[PDB]
Design a protein around this nucleic acid. Structure first.
Length: 57
DNA sequence: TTCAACTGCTTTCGCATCCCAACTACTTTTCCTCACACTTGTACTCCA
């Protein structure tokens, strides 16, 4: 057997609140900047497809 | 009634000229160590 080099250390992150951006007041990007998770364009369409207007809100 | 340029769009996180220096020179900083020309008697006879 063989052990591969790439491992799962720098993969997880959690944010309750924290830093923002100065222009948008949205959560900052960043793995080590303690930054937010992106709800992208396709996830906006997935939250309309459930008809969940408050989860989108 | 058509040809030819101006036209925004392919994804989904995360990865990823001026300055410096070299070596060898020449020089300055000064402080220390003595000589070189001048002069009156004295000495050896000098001429009286």
């Amino acid at each position: 057997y063989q052990r591969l080099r790439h491992m799962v250390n720098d993969k997880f992150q959690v944010r309750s609140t924290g830093p923002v951006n100065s222009l948008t007041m949205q959560p900052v990007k960043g793995r080590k900047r303690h930054g937010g998770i992106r709800v992208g364009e396709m996830e906006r369409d997935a939250l309309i497809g459930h008809g969940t207007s408050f989860l989108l809100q």
